[PDB]
Amino acid sequence: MSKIRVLSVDDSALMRQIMTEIINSHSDMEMVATAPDPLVARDLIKKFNPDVLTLDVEMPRMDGLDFLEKLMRLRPMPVVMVSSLTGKGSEVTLRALELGAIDFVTKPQLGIREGMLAYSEMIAEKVRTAARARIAAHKPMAAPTTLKAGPLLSSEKLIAIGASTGGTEAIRHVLQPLPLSSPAVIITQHMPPGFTRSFAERLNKLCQISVKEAEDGERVLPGHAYIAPGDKHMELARSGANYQIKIHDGPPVNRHRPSVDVLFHSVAKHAGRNAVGVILTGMGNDGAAGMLAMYQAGAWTIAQNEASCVVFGMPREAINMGGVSEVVDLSQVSQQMLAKISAGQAI
């Protein structure tokens, strides 16, 4: 029944109990133990061989970054982060992700300013995703230099991208190598609000291209990557004869807001044959239908291969719909999307 064994690490007693209560309230999981710090966690992980580790990083002394840093280095396993939306919460939470956490759950200090059940189902599904996750896709890997040269394409050229679980790391590998002369890239990463901005700001540092959180009405131009905001949907629009970002609060699609379908459908519509689409690591089918539509309007579509994905769900679905032109290794995606958008069409 409750085959998933979890070890949570929280300095707070009440927090350590809340986590066990909610974990044990589901039939497919159980709390094997809890640890107050990265030292005791090391000990009880060795003893209980748990499947999933939940890491609350907001603890003073030696925090979860240097243990998590060594946990994944010397014999890794599935780790699900716990956050405090707030400012450092993100930076640290993205650090952990860039370090190896599979995913994260949010709870502003307490299950405060938010509701317990929704929180328990969030915890529940994240632990499932982490329990089946392809931990080997997170093997340390130099992102490519790969593509790094070239001149400006027609402004009709665009690259649209969707991702979820593990996307934060995947996205970096697709964007980092791009040159400042690259076509616009519009991206929907299933992420909570606020986190999306911090994410955008971390990429912006690591990349040559500019990376920012998309905003309603703004122009879509080369040398830029546009990250959709959490709890809002993002799509491509057109004013006159130029693209522009469009942000809206429509209902979640595929029970997601921002949704990759919502975005891909608008691209099929306004960019058509002048786009390239890439579906990356994630769970569920968000992006599959919207991607077929891109393929139908004329776009060359790319899906991340299974051995590259922490979660093959999303790419898989897109592929099984016949909406994909080719499956690429994550380490070739940047060079392939850039080479696809750069051949013809302006003419």
User: What is the set of active-site residues?
Assistant: 164, 190, 286
Going across the sheet that includes 275-279, the strands are 210-213, 224-227, 184-189, 158-163, 275-279, 300-304, 326-328
CB 281 within 8 A of CB 167: yes
Give the residue from 192, 338, 183 showing the smallest Cα distance to 252.
192
294 close to 277: Cβ distance less than 8 angstroms: yes
> Which of 72, 69, 62 has its CA nearest to residue 36?
62
- Of 163, 176, 162, 105, nearest to 137 by C-alpha is 163
* Secondary structure of residue 188 in the 3-state scheme: strand
Of 157, 148, 134, 114, the residue nearest 18 (C-alpha)? 114
Q: How far apart (Å, rounded) are the C-alpha atoms in residues 345 and 313?
A: 32
From 178, 214, 190, 202, select the one nearest 341 (Cα to Cα).
Answer: 178
The DSSP bridge partners found for residue 307 are: none
The SS3 of residue 328 is: strand
